[PDB]
Amino acid sequence: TPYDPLTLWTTPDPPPNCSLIQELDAKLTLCLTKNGSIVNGIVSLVGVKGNLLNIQSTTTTVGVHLVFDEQGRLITSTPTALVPQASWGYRQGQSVSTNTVTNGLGFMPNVSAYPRPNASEAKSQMVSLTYLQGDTSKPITMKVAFNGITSLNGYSLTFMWSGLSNYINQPFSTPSCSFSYITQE
Amino acid sequence: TPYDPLTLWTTPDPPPNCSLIQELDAKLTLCLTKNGSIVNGIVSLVGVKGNLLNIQSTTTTVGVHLVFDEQGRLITSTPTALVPQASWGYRQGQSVSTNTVTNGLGFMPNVSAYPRPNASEAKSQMVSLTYLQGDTSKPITMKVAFNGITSLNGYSLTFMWSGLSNYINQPFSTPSCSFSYITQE
Amino acid sequence: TPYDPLTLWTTPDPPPNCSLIQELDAKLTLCLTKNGSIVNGIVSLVGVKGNLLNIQSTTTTVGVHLVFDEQGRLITSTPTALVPQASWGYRQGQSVSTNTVTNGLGFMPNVSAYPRPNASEAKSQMVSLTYLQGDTSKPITMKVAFNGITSLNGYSLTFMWSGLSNYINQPFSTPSCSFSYITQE
């Protein structure tokens, strides 16, 4: 079965794939679909190691950066959460095609609408209230910023879940969380 | 084709079509639209009979499940909310098509991404903070769960609204609630 | 076909196109993408002149209306926030096409789902918690009402950010906010 050019993801159930604090200490599920000038996306993050399994007082916020180049290609180089060997790309069945992204701009956040320097402007963010573990008694905040950590010629997505301190010695895991944005192309 | 193979709804303004506590006590308006690997969803529930008109001290939550067979076809028997006489199929103008769903899996929550056993797992859930009757002064939580009330080959969607206990004798009407999930196929 | 007949926006980085409190005192960024029976929209508003830079103790709500006609076309007169000169049409490159919208209704809110004499009805409203300036400590709400200010034959989209009164002397800015709804056609 062919791959889907409107869909980039990390596969429905990735093995640990992000080294946020320690090696492969988090399991990141990310699906980005292109719906015309808008990409509808869903993300989830569950800790499997260290502080992610047991939030410390310093684990105030958990975040993941995904840096893209001028053509919208993910750069595994740090600060990119995804390890340079984890699967990321076009959906193909329950897996990821080996074809390189040739329509990445259609997946990158529009710089005109979201400038590379203006990573602090309100509009370069979509903010929501969600719950830790899915429990309505453990609220936290998910900030998603665009082009907030680029490279003069590239793109990015950042995910920040704040308000954790209140939940020390508790596993960090978010529900399936949605977000959307205007595409560069 | 006279219909939209990419949409399955209950029609825009359906009559009572659910029996949550007593027979036909609620109107469910549901639209599921597929775009690649994701389904955008909008749901709305308006109580019309019994406890749904007047919330009781013990009425703490209000939910509706929807179970599907191994081919994404809705099974209209408990615990499914929508009754046998209810409209449900692909959009065709303002009505539903009588054609059977040949692409049901395309609208089902991914079992790999949302396991049958792991229903309590934060990932199998999209939760938020919505408001009763669309009143910002009356916040209530909503939790959409994927595949937590299935039957080995089946699939399901579950909508739970809680924190209602503090609105005794008020009518139960939710605002239009958005949601989404990674599809099976 | 250079433009995209599935997107209706105001281009990504538009000049002040709103005169909410005083002339051209606010920039409104709006993108509506059609994905079958549902539309995925992203709203964004920032104040640049007058009271919008300093929230008053009585200013609990700040908002804009967009009124369309029988064919889903924008009426640049009151109550429509967007001034006559403001860019608005099909996305073409980073600008807008000159082609008159020939399918406005596919972007309009379904009147059967969202009735005119029912703007108050919970269903005719999608509500969420968001944050002023995108500051996770400055929560507020956004209400998107469907067909609440029309012309019997018209359609509309009303966005109202509230819970601002307790932020006096602060510049009004909102993050990019998501919303969606069932289409007429």
Coordinates of C-alpha atoms in Angstrom, one line a residue:
Chain A
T1 CA 0.0 0.0 0.0
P2 CA 1.3 3.5 -1.0
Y3 CA 2.3 6.1 1.5
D4 CA 0.1 9.1 2.4
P5 CA 1.6 12.5 1.2
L6 CA -0.8 14.4 3.5
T7 CA 0.4 12.6 6.6
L8 CA 3.6 12.7 8.6
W9 CA 3.9 10.8 11.8
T10 CA 6.1 8.7 14.2
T11 CA 4.0 5.6 13.8
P12 CA 1.0 4.9 16.1
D13 CA 2.9 3.3 18.9
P14 CA 6.6 4.3 18.9
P15 CA 9.1 2.6 21.2
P16 CA 10.9 5.2 23.4
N17 CA 12.1 7.8 20.9
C18 CA 13.1 11.0 22.7
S19 CA 16.0 11.8 24.9
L20 CA 14.7 14.8 26.8
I21 CA 16.6 14.5 30.1
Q22 CA 18.2 11.0 29.8
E23 CA 18.5 8.6 26.8
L24 CA 15.2 7.5 25.2
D25 CA 13.4 8.6 28.4
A26 CA 10.1 9.6 26.6
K27 CA 7.7 8.1 24.1
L28 CA 6.5 10.7 21.7
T29 CA 3.5 10.1 19.5
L30 CA 3.0 12.8 16.8
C31 CA 0.7 12.8 13.8
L32 CA 0.6 15.8 11.5
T33 CA -1.9 15.9 8.7
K34 CA -2.3 18.6 6.0
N35 CA -5.8 20.0 5.4
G36 CA -5.2 22.8 2.9
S37 CA -3.6 25.8 4.6
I38 CA -4.0 24.1 7.9
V39 CA -2.4 21.1 9.6
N40 CA -4.4 19.3 12.2
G41 CA -2.1 17.5 14.7
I42 CA -2.3 15.3 17.7
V43 CA 0.6 14.6 20.2
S44 CA 1.1 12.5 23.4
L45 CA 4.1 12.1 25.6
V46 CA 4.6 9.4 28.2
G47 CA 7.7 9.1 30.4
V48 CA 9.5 5.8 30.8
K49 CA 12.7 6.9 32.5
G50 CA 13.9 9.0 35.4
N51 CA 12.2 12.3 36.3
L52 CA 9.6 11.5 33.6
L53 CA 8.6 8.5 35.6
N54 CA 8.8 10.5 38.8
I55 CA 8.5 14.3 38.5
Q56 CA 10.9 16.2 40.7
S57 CA 10.6 19.7 42.0
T58 CA 12.9 20.9 39.2
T59 CA 10.8 19.2 36.6
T60 CA 8.6 22.3 36.4
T61 CA 8.1 22.0 32.6
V62 CA 8.5 19.2 30.1
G63 CA 9.2 20.2 26.5
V64 CA 10.1 18.8 23.1
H65 CA 11.6 20.7 20.2
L66 CA 11.3 19.6 16.6
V67 CA 13.6 21.6 14.3
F68 CA 13.2 21.7 10.6
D69 CA 15.4 23.0 7.8
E70 CA 14.6 25.4 4.9
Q71 CA 12.7 22.6 3.1
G72 CA 10.8 21.5 6.2
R73 CA 13.1 18.5 6.9
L74 CA 13.4 17.4 10.5
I75 CA 17.0 17.9 11.8
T76 CA 17.8 15.1 14.3
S77 CA 20.6 17.2 15.6
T78 CA 20.0 18.5 19.1
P79 CA 17.9 20.4 20.2
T80 CA 15.6 18.0 18.3
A81 CA 13.9 15.6 20.7
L82 CA 13.6 12.8 18.2
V83 CA 16.7 10.7 18.1
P84 CA 18.5 10.4 14.7
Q85 CA 17.2 6.9 14.2
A86 CA 13.6 7.1 15.4
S87 CA 10.9 6.7 12.7
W88 CA 9.5 10.0 11.4
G89 CA 7.8 10.7 8.1
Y90 CA 5.0 9.7 5.7
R91 CA 2.4 7.2 6.9
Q92 CA 2.4 3.9 5.0
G93 CA 0.2 1.3 6.6
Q94 CA 1.2 1.3 10.3
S95 CA 4.7 2.3 9.5
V96 CA 6.8 5.1 7.9
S97 CA 7.8 5.2 4.2
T98 CA 11.4 5.6 3.3
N99 CA 10.6 8.4 0.8
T100 CA 11.9 11.8 1.8
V101 CA 9.5 14.6 2.5
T102 CA 9.1 16.6 -0.7
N103 CA 6.2 18.8 0.4
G104 CA 7.4 19.7 3.9
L105 CA 6.6 23.4 3.5
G106 CA 3.0 22.3 3.4
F107 CA 3.7 21.0 6.9
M108 CA 5.8 23.8 8.3
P109 CA 4.3 26.8 10.2
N110 CA 4.0 29.9 8.1
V111 CA 6.9 32.3 9.0
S112 CA 5.0 35.4 7.7
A113 CA 2.3 34.6 10.2
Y114 CA 4.8 33.2 12.7
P115 CA 8.2 35.0 12.5
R116 CA 11.5 33.4 13.4
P117 CA 12.5 36.2 15.8
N118 CA 8.9 36.8 17.2
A119 CA 8.9 33.5 19.1
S120 CA 7.4 35.4 22.0
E121 CA 4.5 37.0 20.2
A122 CA 1.2 35.7 21.4
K123 CA 0.2 34.6 17.9
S124 CA 3.2 32.2 17.6
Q125 CA 1.5 30.1 20.2
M126 CA -1.6 28.0 20.8
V127 CA -2.2 27.5 24.5
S128 CA -4.5 25.1 26.3
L129 CA -5.3 23.5 29.6
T130 CA -5.1 19.7 29.9
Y131 CA -4.7 17.1 32.5
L132 CA -1.7 15.0 33.8
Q133 CA -2.4 11.3 33.2
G134 CA -5.9 12.3 32.1
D135 CA -6.9 12.9 35.7
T136 CA -9.2 16.0 36.0
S137 CA -7.6 16.8 39.4
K138 CA -4.1 17.2 37.9
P139 CA -4.3 20.2 35.5
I140 CA -1.3 21.3 33.5
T141 CA -0.7 23.7 30.5
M142 CA 0.4 22.7 27.0
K143 CA 2.0 25.5 25.0
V144 CA 2.8 24.9 21.4
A145 CA 5.0 27.5 19.7
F146 CA 5.9 27.9 16.1
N147 CA 9.3 28.9 14.6
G148 CA 10.3 29.8 18.2
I149 CA 13.7 28.2 17.8
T150 CA 14.7 28.2 14.2
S151 CA 17.8 29.0 12.2
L152 CA 17.3 32.1 10.0
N153 CA 16.3 29.7 7.2
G154 CA 14.3 26.9 8.9
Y155 CA 11.2 26.0 10.9
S156 CA 10.1 24.5 14.3
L157 CA 7.4 23.2 16.6
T158 CA 7.8 23.3 20.4
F159 CA 5.6 21.6 23.0
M160 CA 5.6 22.8 26.6
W161 CA 3.6 21.2 29.4
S162 CA 3.9 23.4 32.5
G163 CA 2.4 23.3 35.9
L164 CA 4.0 20.0 37.0
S165 CA 5.6 20.9 40.3
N166 CA 2.2 20.2 42.0
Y167 CA 2.6 16.6 41.0
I168 CA 6.0 15.4 42.4
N169 CA 6.9 11.7 42.4
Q170 CA 4.2 11.1 39.8
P171 CA 4.6 9.7 36.3
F172 CA 4.6 12.4 33.6
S173 CA 2.2 11.4 30.8
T174 CA -0.2 13.5 28.8
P175 CA -3.5 12.6 27.1
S176 CA -3.7 12.6 23.3
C177 CA -3.4 16.4 22.7
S178 CA -4.6 18.3 19.7
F179 CA -3.3 21.5 18.0
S180 CA -3.3 23.2 14.6
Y181 CA -1.6 25.9 12.5
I182 CA -1.4 27.9 9.3
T183 CA 1.1 26.3 6.9
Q184 CA 4.0 28.0 5.2
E185 CA 2.9 26.5 1.9
Chain B
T1 CA -21.1 10.3 -6.1
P2 CA -24.1 11.8 -4.4
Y3 CA -22.5 11.8 -1.0
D4 CA -19.3 12.5 1.0
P5 CA -17.4 9.2 1.6
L6 CA -15.2 11.1 4.0
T7 CA -17.9 12.1 6.4
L8 CA -20.3 10.2 8.7
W9 CA -22.9 12.2 10.6
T10 CA -26.3 12.0 12.4
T11 CA -27.6 14.8 10.1
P12 CA -27.4 18.5 11.2
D13 CA -30.5 18.7 13.4
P14 CA -31.6 15.2 14.5
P15 CA -34.5 14.5 16.9
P16 CA -34.0 12.8 20.2
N17 CA -31.9 9.7 19.3
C18 CA -30.3 8.4 22.5
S19 CA -31.5 6.6 25.6
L20 CA -28.9 7.3 28.3
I21 CA -31.0 6.9 31.5
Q22 CA -34.5 6.6 30.3
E23 CA -35.8 6.1 26.8
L24 CA -35.0 8.9 24.3
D25 CA -33.7 11.5 26.7
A26 CA -31.1 13.1 24.5
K27 CA -30.1 14.7 21.2
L28 CA -26.7 13.7 19.9
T29 CA -25.4 15.7 16.9
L30 CA -22.2 14.1 15.7
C31 CA -19.9 14.8 12.7
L32 CA -16.8 12.7 11.9
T33 CA -14.7 14.0 9.0
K34 CA -11.6 12.2 7.8
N35 CA -8.5 14.0 6.5
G36 CA -5.6 11.7 6.0
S37 CA -4.6 9.9 9.2
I38 CA -6.8 12.1 11.4
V39 CA -10.5 12.6 12.1
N40 CA -11.8 16.0 13.1
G41 CA -14.8 15.6 15.3
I42 CA -17.6 17.9 16.6
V43 CA -20.1 16.6 19.1
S44 CA -23.0 18.1 21.0
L45 CA -25.4 16.8 23.6
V46 CA -28.6 18.3 24.7
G47 CA -30.6 16.6 27.5
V48 CA -34.4 16.4 26.8
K49 CA -35.8 13.8 29.2
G50 CA -35.6 13.2 33.0
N51 CA -32.3 13.9 34.8
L52 CA -31.0 15.4 31.6
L53 CA -33.4 18.3 32.0
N54 CA -32.8 18.6 35.7
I55 CA -29.4 17.5 37.1
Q56 CA -29.7 15.5 40.4
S57 CA -27.2 15.6 43.3
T58 CA -26.2 12.1 42.2
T59 CA -26.0 13.0 38.5
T60 CA -22.2 13.4 38.6
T61 CA -21.4 12.5 35.0
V62 CA -23.1 12.1 31.6
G63 CA -21.6 9.9 28.9
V64 CA -22.4 8.3 25.6
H65 CA -20.5 5.5 24.1
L66 CA -20.5 4.4 20.4
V67 CA -19.3 0.9 19.6
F68 CA -18.3 -0.3 16.1
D69 CA -17.7 -3.8 14.6
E70 CA -14.5 -5.0 13.0
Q71 CA -15.3 -3.0 9.9
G72 CA -16.1 0.3 11.5
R73 CA -19.9 -0.2 11.4
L74 CA -21.9 1.2 14.3
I75 CA -23.6 -1.5 16.3
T76 CA -26.9 0.0 17.5
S77 CA -27.3 -2.0 20.7
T78 CA -26.1 -1.3 24.3
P79 CA -23.8 0.2 25.3
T80 CA -24.1 2.2 22.1
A81 CA -26.0 5.5 22.7
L82 CA -27.7 6.0 19.4
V83 CA -30.9 3.9 19.0
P84 CA -31.7 1.6 16.0
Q85 CA -34.0 4.2 14.4
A86 CA -31.4 6.9 14.5
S87 CA -29.8 8.4 11.3
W88 CA -26.1 7.7 10.8
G89 CA -24.1 7.3 7.7
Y90 CA -22.3 9.5 5.1
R91 CA -23.3 13.0 4.5
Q92 CA -25.4 13.5 1.4
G93 CA -26.7 17.1 1.3
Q94 CA -28.3 17.6 4.6
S95 CA -29.3 14.0 4.9
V96 CA -27.6 10.6 5.4
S97 CA -26.9 8.1 2.6
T98 CA -28.4 4.7 2.9
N99 CA -25.3 3.2 1.4
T100 CA -23.3 0.9 3.8
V101 CA -19.9 2.1 5.0
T102 CA -17.2 0.4 3.0
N103 CA -14.4 2.5 4.4
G104 CA -15.3 2.3 8.1
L105 CA -11.8 1.6 9.3
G106 CA -10.8 4.9 7.9
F107 CA -12.9 6.5 10.6
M108 CA -11.9 4.2 13.5
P109 CA -9.5 5.1 16.3
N110 CA -6.2 3.4 15.9
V111 CA -6.0 0.2 18.1
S112 CA -2.2 0.3 18.0
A113 CA -2.3 3.9 19.0
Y114 CA -5.2 3.3 21.3
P115 CA -5.2 -0.3 22.7
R116 CA -8.3 -2.2 23.8
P117 CA -6.9 -3.2 27.2
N118 CA -5.1 0.2 27.9
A119 CA -8.3 2.3 28.1
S120 CA -7.2 3.9 31.4
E121 CA -4.0 5.0 29.7
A122 CA -3.8 8.7 29.3
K123 CA -3.0 8.3 25.6
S124 CA -6.3 6.6 24.9
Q125 CA -7.8 9.9 26.0
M126 CA -8.3 13.4 24.9
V127 CA -9.5 15.6 27.8
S128 CA -10.3 19.2 28.3
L129 CA -12.2 21.9 30.1
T130 CA -15.5 22.9 28.5
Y131 CA -18.6 24.8 29.8
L132 CA -22.2 23.7 30.5
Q133 CA -24.7 25.2 28.1
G134 CA -21.8 27.3 26.7
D135 CA -21.6 29.4 29.9
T136 CA -18.0 30.4 30.7
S137 CA -19.0 30.7 34.4
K138 CA -20.0 27.0 34.5
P139 CA -16.9 25.0 33.7
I140 CA -17.2 21.2 33.2
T141 CA -14.7 18.6 32.1
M142 CA -15.0 16.5 29.0
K143 CA -13.1 13.3 28.3
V144 CA -13.2 11.5 24.9
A145 CA -11.8 8.0 25.2
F146 CA -10.8 5.7 22.2
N147 CA -11.3 1.9 22.3
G148 CA -12.2 1.5 25.9
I149 CA -15.6 -0.2 25.5
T150 CA -14.9 -2.5 22.5
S151 CA -15.3 -6.2 21.7
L152 CA -12.0 -7.7 20.6
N153 CA -12.7 -6.9 16.9
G154 CA -14.6 -3.8 17.6
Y155 CA -13.9 -0.1 18.1
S156 CA -15.5 2.6 20.2
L157 CA -15.8 6.3 21.1
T158 CA -16.9 7.4 24.6
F159 CA -17.9 10.9 25.7
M160 CA -17.9 11.7 29.4
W161 CA -18.8 15.0 31.0
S162 CA -18.1 15.4 34.7
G163 CA -18.1 17.9 37.5
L164 CA -21.8 18.3 36.9
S165 CA -22.7 17.7 40.5
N166 CA -22.5 21.5 41.2
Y167 CA -25.4 22.5 38.9
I168 CA -28.4 20.8 40.5
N169 CA -31.7 21.2 38.8
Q170 CA -30.1 22.9 35.8
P171 CA -30.7 21.4 32.3
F172 CA -27.8 19.3 30.7
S173 CA -26.7 20.9 27.4
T174 CA -23.1 20.8 26.1
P175 CA -21.6 23.3 23.6
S176 CA -20.3 22.1 20.3
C177 CA -17.3 20.1 21.3
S178 CA -14.3 19.5 19.0
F179 CA -12.0 16.5 19.2
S180 CA -9.9 14.2 17.0
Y181 CA -7.8 11.0 16.9
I182 CA -5.4 8.9 14.9
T183 CA -7.4 6.6 12.6
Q184 CA -7.0 2.9 12.3
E185 CA -6.7 2.8 8.5
Chain C
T1 CA -5.8 27.0 -10.6
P2 CA -3.2 29.1 -8.7
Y3 CA -5.3 29.8 -5.6
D4 CA -6.6 27.3 -3.1
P5 CA -10.4 26.9 -3.2
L6 CA -10.3 25.3 0.2
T7 CA -8.9 28.2 2.2
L8 CA -10.3 31.6 3.1
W9 CA -8.0 33.8 5.0
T10 CA -6.6 37.3 5.5
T11 CA -3.1 36.4 4.5
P12 CA -0.6 35.6 7.3
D13 CA 0.8 39.0 8.4
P14 CA -2.0 41.5 7.7
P15 CA -1.9 45.3 8.7
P16 CA -4.5 46.6 11.1
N17 CA -7.8 45.5 9.5
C18 CA -10.0 46.2 12.5
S19 CA -11.4 49.3 14.2
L20 CA -12.9 47.7 17.3
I21 CA -12.6 50.6 19.9
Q22 CA -11.2 53.2 17.5
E23 CA -10.1 53.3 13.8
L24 CA -7.7 50.5 12.8
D25 CA -6.9 49.6 16.4
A26 CA -6.6 45.9 15.9
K27 CA -5.1 43.2 13.6
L28 CA -7.3 40.2 13.0
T29 CA -5.7 37.1 11.5
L30 CA -8.2 34.5 10.3
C31 CA -7.9 31.3 8.3
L32 CA -10.8 29.0 7.4
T33 CA -9.9 25.6 5.7
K34 CA -12.6 23.3 4.4
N35 CA -12.1 19.6 5.2
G36 CA -15.3 18.1 4.0
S37 CA -18.3 18.6 6.3
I38 CA -16.2 20.4 8.9
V39 CA -14.0 23.5 8.8
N40 CA -10.8 24.0 10.8
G41 CA -10.3 27.7 11.6
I42 CA -7.5 29.6 13.5
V43 CA -8.3 33.0 15.0
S44 CA -5.8 35.5 16.3
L45 CA -6.3 39.1 17.5
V46 CA -3.8 41.8 18.8
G47 CA -4.5 45.4 19.7
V48 CA -2.3 48.2 18.5
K49 CA -4.2 51.5 19.3
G50 CA -6.2 52.9 22.1
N51 CA -7.9 51.0 24.9
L52 CA -6.8 47.7 23.3
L53 CA -3.4 48.4 24.6
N54 CA -4.8 49.1 28.1
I55 CA -7.7 46.9 29.2
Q56 CA -10.2 48.8 31.4
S57 CA -11.8 47.6 34.6
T58 CA -15.1 47.1 32.7
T59 CA -13.7 45.6 29.6
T60 CA -14.5 42.0 30.3
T61 CA -15.0 41.2 26.6
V62 CA -13.3 42.1 23.4
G63 CA -14.4 40.8 20.1
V64 CA -15.1 40.8 16.4
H65 CA -18.0 39.8 14.1
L66 CA -17.7 38.6 10.5
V67 CA -21.0 38.7 8.7
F68 CA -21.5 36.8 5.4
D69 CA -24.4 36.8 2.9
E70 CA -26.6 34.3 1.2
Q71 CA -23.6 33.0 -0.8
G72 CA -21.1 33.0 2.0
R73 CA -19.5 36.3 1.0
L74 CA -18.1 38.9 3.4
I75 CA -20.2 42.1 3.9
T76 CA -17.6 44.8 4.8
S77 CA -20.2 46.9 6.7
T78 CA -21.3 47.0 10.3
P79 CA -21.2 44.8 12.4
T80 CA -18.4 43.3 10.4
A81 CA -15.0 44.0 12.1
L82 CA -13.0 43.7 8.8
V83 CA -12.9 47.1 7.2
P84 CA -13.7 47.4 3.4
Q85 CA -10.0 47.6 2.4
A86 CA -8.9 44.5 4.4
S87 CA -7.7 41.5 2.4
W88 CA -10.1 38.6 2.4
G89 CA -10.7 35.7 0.0
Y90 CA -9.1 32.5 -1.3
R91 CA -5.5 31.9 -0.3
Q92 CA -3.2 32.5 -3.3
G93 CA 0.4 32.3 -2.4
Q94 CA 0.9 34.5 0.7
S95 CA -1.8 36.9 -0.5
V96 CA -5.4 36.4 -1.6
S97 CA -7.0 35.6 -5.0
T98 CA -9.2 38.2 -6.7
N99 CA -11.7 35.6 -7.7
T100 CA -15.1 36.1 -6.0
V101 CA -15.8 33.3 -3.7
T102 CA -18.0 30.9 -5.6
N103 CA -18.5 28.5 -2.8
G104 CA -18.8 30.6 0.4
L105 CA -21.4 28.3 1.8
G106 CA -18.9 25.4 2.0
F107 CA -17.2 27.6 4.7
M108 CA -20.4 28.8 6.3
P109 CA -21.8 27.4 9.6
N110 CA -24.7 25.0 8.9
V111 CA -28.0 26.8 9.8
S112 CA -29.7 23.5 10.6
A113 CA -27.0 22.8 13.2
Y114 CA -26.7 26.4 14.3
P115 CA -30.1 28.2 13.9
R116 CA -30.5 32.0 13.8
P117 CA -33.1 32.4 16.5
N118 CA -30.9 30.1 18.7
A119 CA -27.5 31.9 19.0
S120 CA -27.9 31.6 22.8
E121 CA -28.2 27.8 22.4
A122 CA -25.2 25.8 23.8
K123 CA -24.9 24.0 20.4
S124 CA -24.5 27.3 18.6
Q125 CA -21.4 27.9 20.7
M126 CA -17.9 26.3 20.9
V127 CA -16.1 27.4 24.0
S128 CA -12.5 26.9 25.4
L129 CA -10.0 28.1 28.0
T130 CA -7.1 30.0 26.6
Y131 CA -4.5 32.5 27.7
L132 CA -4.1 36.3 27.4
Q133 CA -0.9 37.1 25.4
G134 CA -0.3 33.3 25.7
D135 CA 0.8 33.6 29.3
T136 CA -0.1 30.4 31.2
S137 CA -1.0 32.5 34.2
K138 CA -3.4 34.8 32.4
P139 CA -6.3 32.4 31.5
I140 CA -9.3 33.6 29.6
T141 CA -12.1 32.2 27.4
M142 CA -12.9 32.3 23.7
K143 CA -16.4 31.9 22.4
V144 CA -17.2 31.3 18.8
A145 CA -20.9 31.6 18.2
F146 CA -22.5 30.4 15.0
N147 CA -25.0 32.6 13.0
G148 CA -25.7 34.9 16.0
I149 CA -25.7 38.1 14.0
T150 CA -27.1 37.6 10.5
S151 CA -29.6 38.9 8.1
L152 CA -32.2 36.1 7.8
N153 CA -30.3 35.0 4.6
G154 CA -26.9 35.6 6.1
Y155 CA -24.3 33.6 8.1
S156 CA -21.8 34.7 10.6
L157 CA -18.8 34.0 12.9
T158 CA -18.6 35.8 16.2
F159 CA -15.4 35.6 18.3
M160 CA -15.5 36.8 21.9
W161 CA -12.6 36.7 24.4
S162 CA -13.8 37.3 28.0
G163 CA -12.4 37.2 31.5
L164 CA -10.2 40.2 30.7
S165 CA -11.5 42.7 33.3
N166 CA -9.1 41.4 35.8
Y167 CA -6.0 42.3 33.7
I168 CA -6.5 46.1 33.7
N169 CA -3.8 48.2 32.0
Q170 CA -2.5 45.3 30.0
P171 CA -2.2 45.2 26.2
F172 CA -4.8 42.9 24.7
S173 CA -3.3 40.0 22.7
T174 CA -4.4 36.4 22.1
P175 CA -2.7 33.3 21.0
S176 CA -3.7 31.6 17.7
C177 CA -6.9 29.9 18.8
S178 CA -8.5 26.8 17.2
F179 CA -12.2 26.3 16.5
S180 CA -14.3 24.4 14.0
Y181 CA -17.9 23.7 12.9
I182 CA -20.2 21.8 10.5
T183 CA -20.6 23.4 7.1
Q184 CA -23.8 24.4 5.3
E185 CA -22.8 22.6 2.2

